[PDB]
């Protein structure tokens, strides 16, 4: 036993678990697959534009309690995300301004849009976040797809669409490939879509003035930058009754307990001896990652805020993207950012890189003026082909798995413990989740150490 606990994966989740066990006084060792310490939390302060840049997650939610504390104690300083102005909606190619986040009640689609939204939150509430697979009608629910449900519950094609877009960007998938039960679950465990869809508050409420990968770096620096072995891809795990043996090719390590902090899909790439119980086996073998693009355009001035727009945008057909401002007071030049996922990623990944960029800039132009036509910096980062993330923004599920293996999302197997945002009780999918998941995992192993 080289160390007490070896944490596989250096995401905010693995890092949170590391700092947790370390502060508790246990010997810790974090093993990373590639050469950078963040996870789906990727930062570059050397960033070609005027300010550090995040290629991964970066928004902090107002109820993101654990993340705020962790990073704040680490010395990081937050900053407001939201921007003053009208949010924009492009429904069926038409540009609609929403003052006070509110859309003209007279528009024909708004009413059913407001109703279907509530209807969703209700469904989400009927199945919690604790025992979704056990809720009053899980089985039934995990049989339909968010697609067929929208079909069975919404008349308007636009309401149907802007619902679809929401799913696609919020998850990395399209409603036609996502369990209805799994979505109600997600909406529920992230405190409703109103919270999930906020642009000023809710989940999108603030940033780490400095970059999001910092929580993991600062933890690394504190706990001991040498306790992180980068480029140590784990490919096999002998997990028996006295401890666990990790293998990175011919290389190997051993600890009493290990916490595997990553997405279920990413973990399925690792061989287990003995085999994992069919329950978890199925879960990490049938829980895919979304498909996603993170696009960013940088300009000299925030011509959108300065023209009365928040920079927030929801487009159902031109491109199929959610748009948000990313201009922190510190940055030298303004930055607008969009997210293309699911079937939208699909359609666009089909074109050339430049074809995509213009499609994006064209959208920006028709939404905030001609000043968007010629940006100072433009970058896109495809995540569906990322070596280790292997996917979109979060994990998602097709009909038939959450209801029958969801439990495996959390339960340990011998000395192997599961961390990673997807293991959190709440906010599984967001950073908050990664932190909690990893702290929960640690708390568990710490108690296992005192016998
Ligand atoms: C474009 C994008 C934008 C996002 N925006 C937000 C946002 O605004 N707010 C928010 O809250 N969340 C956001 N997220 C989600 C957030 O990034 C995740 O919830 C969080 O980073 C998950 O953390 P994790 O530590 O569980 O996993 P990861 O960050 O995926 O880290 C797992 C680690 O495991 C390593 N690993 C994988 N396989 C192996 C192996 N075999 N051996 C060793 N190491 C391995 C990986 O290299 C990686 O570093 C976003 C995600 C994306 C993709």
Numbering used by the authors: 30 to 480
Question: Mind quoting what the paper says about this structure?
Answer:
Originally described in B. oxydans strain IH-35A, CHAO carries out the initial step in the biodegradation pathway of cyclohexylamine, a high volume chemical used industrially as a corrosion inhibitor and in the rubber and water treatment industries. The CHAO structure can be divided into two domains: a cofactor-binding domain composed of two four-stranded β-sheets (one parallel, one mixed) and seven α-helices, and a substrate-binding domain consisting of a twisted seven-stranded mixed β-sheet and eight α-helices. The active site of CHAO is located in a buried cavity located at the interface of the substrate- and cofactor-binding domains. An examination of the three dimensional atomic structure of CHAO reveals that the overall fold is substantially similar to that of the human MAO B monomer, with a RMSD of 1.1 Å for the coordinates of the α-carbon atoms.
In order to determine the holoenzyme structure of CHAO, we employed molecular replacement using the A chain from human MAO B (30% sequence identity), truncated to remove the C-terminal predicted transmembrane helical segment, as a search model. Four molecules of CHAO were identified per asymmetric unit. Most of the polypeptide chain could be modeled into the electron density maps: residues 30–480 in the case of the holoenzyme and residues 30–478 in the ternary complex. For the apoenzyme structure, 90% of the residues fall into the favored region of a Ramachandran plot and 2.2% are outliers. When superimposed, the structures of CHAO crystallized with and without substrate present are very similar (RMSD 0.26 Å), with no significant differences in the positioning of secondary structural elements and with only minor differences in the conformation of loop regions. The structures of the CHAO holoenzyme and complex with cyclohexanone are remarkably similar, suggesting that there are no significant conformational changes associated with the binding of product in the active site. One side of this cavity is occupied by the flavin cofactor, held in place by hydrogen bonds and Van der Waals interactions with the protein. The isoalloxazine ring of the FAD cofactor is planar, and a lysine residue that is hydrogen bonded to the N5 atom of FAD in other MAOs (via a water molecule) is positioned to play that role in CHAO. In addition to the substrate-binding cavity, CHAO has a second cavity located closer to the protein surface that is shielded from the bulk solvent by a loop of the polypeptide chain (residues 128–138). This intermediate cavity is separated from the substrate-binding cavity by a series of amino acid side chains (T198, L199, M226, and F351).
